[PDB]
Amino acid sequence: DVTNVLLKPVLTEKVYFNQMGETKKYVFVVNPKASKTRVKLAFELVYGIKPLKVNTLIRKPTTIRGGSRFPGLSKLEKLAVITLPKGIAISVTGE
């Protein structure tokens, strides 16, 4: 509802491999406390097309910059893979 559960879209080799060929799959990063139903509602209230299904990924934090004078940990990410129906492809930028 508040639509703070759609933080940032991400574009990788896997994302672009899926984002072509009829059904498009758009991968965003979401609030780690959000659920699939909240993700579908946010896409409804901010894009307008009902997702066909949603898949979720949790990437655990890991050590980064190891051996550097001050080592640091990573940040917890939840990834969401929305898939719109056949023949529809909306743009992530431009509204």
Binding site: V10, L11, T12, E13, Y16
Partner: peptide
């Protein structure tokens, strides 16, 4: 031609070389 010249190396953040997008190479590295 020109897009061929602008696709060699210059690896983008989330991508690698070689498989540079055929249409999207003017946004990050503009």
């Amino acid at each position: 031609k020109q897009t061929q010249d602008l696709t060699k190396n210059m690896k983008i953040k989330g991508f690698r070389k070689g498989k540079v997008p055929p249409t999207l190479a003017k946004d990050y590295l503009d």
